[PDB]
Amino acid sequence: SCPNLPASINYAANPKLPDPFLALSGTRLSKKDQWPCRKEEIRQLFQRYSYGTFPPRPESVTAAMSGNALKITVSEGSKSMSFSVNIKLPSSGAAPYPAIIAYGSASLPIPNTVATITYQNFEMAADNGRGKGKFYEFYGSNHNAGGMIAAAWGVDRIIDALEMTPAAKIDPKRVGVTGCSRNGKGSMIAGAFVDRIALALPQEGGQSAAGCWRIADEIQKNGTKVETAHQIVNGDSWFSTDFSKYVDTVPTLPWDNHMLHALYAYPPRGLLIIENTAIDYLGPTSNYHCATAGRKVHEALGVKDYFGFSQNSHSDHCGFPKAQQPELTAFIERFLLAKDTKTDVWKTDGKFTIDERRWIDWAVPSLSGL
Ligand SMILES: *[C@@H]1O[C@H](CO)[C@@H](O[C@@H]2O[C@H](CO)[C@@H](O[C@@H]3O[C@H](CO)[C@@H](O)[C@H](O[C@H]4O[C@H](CO)[C@@H](O)[C@H](O)[C@@H]4O)[C@@H]3O)[C@H](O)[C@H]2NC(C)=O)[C@H](O)[C@H]1NC(C)=O
């Protein structure tokens, strides 16, 4: 349906967030029916420069309920791998149930109307181990995928297995995803690459997730210690070994993380970013300005209200404040509990400067076809 990227891309150093509506072809999007092919371009850019290859569904996926365990087996040629996820069914409403996949564990309050699928994402592909995890046992240790995109592949397989196994009692069309800190990152990427996810809730994922690389670079340049591209490729195997060629030349990247958010605008799905203005290393002003740029794609495609942003000041990392509950309730209501509640939430309590034009030198086009 869409072409692959040129063998090589020449992108002139740009100190602002690249126009998400500007195809590498050269033509700027003016028609809705062009967006799908730009969306793949973006997906392919992320995999080449930062994430590694997000593989397709393997030749076999099979699943099997075994008590509360959903045991998912896959194979490709003679190779086979199994990974198990715990499902804790809720105590309110009737099957098939809406669910949330938690990277390791939730730090959001999940209502008693929504199932809790507990995904062992570091078990799938390790936190700080190059080529370690089920993913790499299956595909090879030398496979160029990073532990973030390999975890996201596991979420694609989790949903394949819920489509195959009504026994699990989970509506496949209403599976959310969430995580905090490192799993804010994972959950954000899972939701960006798995189109079938109904709602992503990344919490305090900061840079790589909510924040843009260019703004992290400028936060650093201004004196405050923050999670820059240069920093993030060190304590972990989250990104492909290729990412560390580019960390020092961010302005020449034909993309930024605002285009990760853009992947959520088609097919339209819920994205509430929950963030913390108090912790410097997240880059509070990056998160806000980066998100605000990402939502421009949602705005063009008339699905603005499917992308929520909430930034709150709290000393404790990953402690959900009660202040952010109405916003979380609303997004769970609309996209998981199939209720009809409004979700235009875009707020920070942060006291930094809010200047869009600093990062966004491009206009939201009127897309015809919608
Ligand atoms: C990194 O630090 C640099 C420091 O240079 C910083 O870039 C600068 O940001 C400031 C803050 O916005 C810019 O200064 C602005 O300039 C306009 C006029 O040119 C002023 O009117 C703005 O002020 C208003 O805001 C005040 C408080 O909100 C109001 O009380 C007041 O009445 C005005 O309405 C403001 O001074 C400056 O132009 C840029 N400089 C450059 C080089 O672009 C950058 O913001 C910092 N980056 C990060 C990541 O923090």
Numbering used by the authors: 20 to 389
Q: What did the paper state?
A:
Glucuronyl esterases (GEs) are carbohydrate-active enzymes that are able to cleave ester linkages between the alcohols of the aromatic polymer lignin and 4-O-methylglucuronic acid (4-O-MeGlcA) moieties on glucuronoxylan in the plant cell wall, a linkage which contributes to the recalcitrance of plant biomass. Several more experimental structures have since been obtained, totaling eight structures (three from fungal species and five from bacterial species) from diverse organisms. GEs belong to the α/β hydrolase (ABH) superfamily, with a catalytic triad common to serine hydrolases consisting of a Ser nucleophile, a basic His residue and an acidic Glu/Asp residue. However, one of the putative GEs from Lentithecium fluviatile, LfCE15C, lacks many of the additional sequence characteristics of a fungal CE15-B as described in Ernst et al.. As highlighted in Fig. 1(a), a highly conserved glutamate residue in a substrate-interacting helix-containing loop (here denoted αL) is a glycine in LfCE15C, while a conserved substrate-interacting tryptophan is instead a tyrosine.
The structure was determined to a maximum resolution of 2.65 Å (crystal form A) with good overall geometry. The final model contains four protein chains, each with an N-glycosylation site at Asn241 modelled with variable number of carbohydrate units. As seen in other fungal members of CE15, LfCE15C is stabilized by several disulfide bonds (Cys21–Cys56, Cys199–Cys337 and Cys231–Cys309). The active-site structure is stabilized by one of the disulfide bonds (Cys199–Cys337), also conserved in Cip2, that joins the strand bearing the serine nucleophile to the loop bearing the catalytic histidine. The glutamate residue can presumably be functionally equivalent to glutamine, so this difference is unlikely to be of functional importance. In contrast, the characteristic glutamate of fungal CE15-B further along in the αL region (Glu324 in CuGE), which interacts with O2 of the GlcA moiety as well as the xylan backbone, is substituted by a glycine in LfCE15C (Gly254). Furthermore, an otherwise extremely conserved tryptophan in the whole CE15 family (Trp358 in OtCE15A and Trp368 in CuGE and CE15-B, phenylalanine or tryptophan in fungal CE15-A), which interacts with GlcA O2 and is located at the end of β-strand 7 in the loop following the canonical acid residue position, is found to be a tyrosine in LfCE15C. Although in principle this is a conservative substitution, the hydrogen bond between the NH group of tryptophan and O2 of the GlcA moiety will almost certainly be lost given the conformation of the corresponding tyrosine in the active site.
